[PDB]
Structure formats: structure tokens, C-alpha cells
Design a protein around this nucleic acid. Structure first.
Ligand code: SF4
Length: 85
DNA sequence: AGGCCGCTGCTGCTCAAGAGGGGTTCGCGGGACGGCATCGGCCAATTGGCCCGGTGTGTCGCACGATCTGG
């Protein structure tokens, strides 16, 4: 349908700062990614599943070692066990 | 001979080598002190699963059956 022939051939920016700009969650409620009280961690996991820079997000999160929120489709203890493994 | 009334020339301002003695800085270190930063547990708390148990209302999968248009 309205796919623009996979981004088409009309582009003038020819400039990218980094993989932040390709983040899908930026098009989405930030609050849902930090479940307070008990919360849930599956809808935002589904959102991350379709992210095109999931690997980069996971790598950056692990390298900087944030212990809050859900990054790369994984929550805190998945990151912790991956770090410990 | 002094005072004074003019002339007349001149000048000036402006537009284009050690040596000693003493208080102070800072500069390294140098370590001591106190403090805040990091890591096993840990249980019973909101959301959200995950279902029983009743019908109904309303979509969908297909049976009998009538009307109508084309073949
Ligand atoms: S993987 Fe990272 S960048 Fe992608 S949507 Fe999830 S949190 Fe955002």
C-alpha cells in the first residue's frame, strides 16, 4: 500500500546522528517502558520486538549498565543474568 | 629723555656583578580521617493472567427454499 517503494528514492537529508533516531519507542509512550508499582512488561516487549535497532539498544544499555526500565526487549533481571552469564 | 601711536617683521596654530640573609609560597607527598557507594537476600503487594459459571446479542458456517436475471 503506502510503502513509498521502501523509502523511495527521494531523500535530501543524507545525514544521520546515530541509532537513536531509528528508535521505535520514541513513537510511543515513554511511561509504559518503566512499569511502576507492580506493572507489566509484555506490551512494551512486543513494541521492542519490532524495533529495527534492538541489538544496538541492548548493546548500549549493557555497556552503560542501566538497572532500570526495559531495553532491547529485555527487563532488568534478564540483563542481569546475561551479564552474570 | 620717557611715554605713546602706529608700522613692520617674526613666530605660532590649524585645514588639507656578584654574594649573603630571611620570610613566604607552593608543591609534592603523605597519610589519616570520615564518609557514602556497592552487593547477597525477600516477601507479599498494585497491575495483569486465567479461568468457572450463567444466559443473551450478535457475527459466521453452513442447510432448505423463493425471486430474478441471464444463458
Ligand atoms: S529496543 Fe530499545 S530503542 Fe528499540 S523500541 Fe525497545 S527500548 Fe526503544
Amino acid at each position: 500500500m503506502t510503502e513509498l517503494f521502501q523509502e523511495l528514492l527521494v531523500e535530501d537529508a543524507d545525514e544521520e546522528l546515530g541509532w537513536q533516531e531509528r528508535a521505535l519507542c520514541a513513537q510511543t509512550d515513554p511511561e509504559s517502558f518503566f512499569p511502576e508499582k507492580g506493572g507489566s512488561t509484555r506490551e512494551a516487549k512486543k513494541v521492542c520486538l519490532a524495533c529495527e535497532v534492538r541489538s544496538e539498544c541492548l548493546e548500549y544499555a549493557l555497556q552503560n549498565d542501566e538497572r532500570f526500565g526495559i531495553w532491547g526487549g529485555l527487563s532488568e533481571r534478564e540483563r542481569r543474568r546475561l551479564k552474570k552469564k
